[model samples]
Target: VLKARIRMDAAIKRGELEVLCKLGHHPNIINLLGACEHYLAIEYAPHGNLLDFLRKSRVLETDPAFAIANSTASTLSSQQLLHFAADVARGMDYLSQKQFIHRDLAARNILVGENYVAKIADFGLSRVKKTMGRLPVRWMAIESLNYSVYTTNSDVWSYGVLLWEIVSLGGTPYCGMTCAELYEKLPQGYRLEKPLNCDDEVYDLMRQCWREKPYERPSFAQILVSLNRMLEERKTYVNTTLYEKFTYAGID
Candidate 1:
């Protein structure tokens, strides 16, 4: 897919391209294929960005007629939603290891490709924790919002908000709250409430990401481990129905 930088300054676009090239290929990272003076040619993701995908899934679940007309799109299962979270965590872990910080780590920045693989995208605001101007206030950590300090730990805080987005199926974080409200409340221990479909374990992880102290937040590697473990355990339960049936039959 090609992204044009018609209005964006060449210097800024060049910096983003350079960063994408620096962080080579990873399954969960949108790979840089080619570049032009005013355009970026990245890998094509047929399913598009995660936020739109989740919103479409929500529509499919809620509107039967719309879903029938768009039969190609399927409703997302809990396991599939969790998988997206894990995929993002894995990608962020790689970026963190490379000493890069994705200042924007929300669902809108994650692309879903073939086989439902979620790849981290949009490096326009990314840097080596050494850099920014306009911030994504809702997804930002307190330090980042107030002090202009950007770190991998701050990125971790954003990841928690991202997880909330996935679980909420693309719901806007802190809906109806203004930047001023969020800025005031977040420092006072305010956080996004647990999503309706989110399990306790997943919500707990989100809370961990939004800790008062940035140092207290889990690293992307640690977050990946937790997410992977949750996916594996969930799969075991999902796949055990046959065994459960057999055991009950024997008892009867």
Candidate 2:
């Protein structure tokens, strides 16, 4: 698909085009398709962005009557959410392997597609490793906030926040907290509380990603392995939870 849109800022335009072209084609990552100064063609995500998908899915999961009445309703299944997380992990893993840093790795930047498949998108804020300036305060690691340093591990910290968004059914991170408040409170060992349905093991993974030190966090490769392991363990529950399915498979 020839998807292109006008970029309002020259800096964003350069970052998006440069990063997409440099990364090339990958299933988990959105394809650049084509590009020029005026427009940049890209893959079409038929179902639109992940944030909207998550909101709708949350409603259906929370409302049983709505779910039962709306038999034709289409939303991400619990298993599919898990797969989506795994897919994002794969894409980020590729970027990390290539020494690229996705400064913004959030649910809003992820795109959903046919069968609830998700792909990482919006590289406008991305940069090569070690290059850093402004970053999304809520999603950034402490190091990235304190110093203008960015690395794949910082992306890992953002992935932890992203995971919280998914598990919370699109709840806002650090809800109602300002940047100053977060900076003040986070360092004293404060972190987000586990989402209602999020299993202990998965929440543990989020904590793993948010370690105070950047190197203490798992790499994207390790995240892929952990997500895959969680998925594998669910097959054993294949017979137990036809009635118990919700976000991130039955594990949530």
How many residue pairs clash in each candidate at the backbone level? Answer: 0, 1
TM-score of each: 0.79, 0.78
Report the C-alpha lDDT of model 2 over 1-252, residue by residue, as the tens digit.
233342221111324567667887778887655556736556567777887777766545567576656542235445666788899999999878888777889998998765567888874444433654556898988888777678888899999988887766677787767889888888888988876556787788899999998888998889989888888784421111223444332212
Candidate 2 displacement at residue 162 in angstroms: 0.4
Off by over 4 Å in 2: 1-18, 36-38, 60-65, 68-74, 123-134, 235-252
Cα lDDT tens digits, model 1, 69-147, are 6542237766788889999999999989988777888998899987999999874544424546567888999998888
RMSD of each: 9.1, 6.1
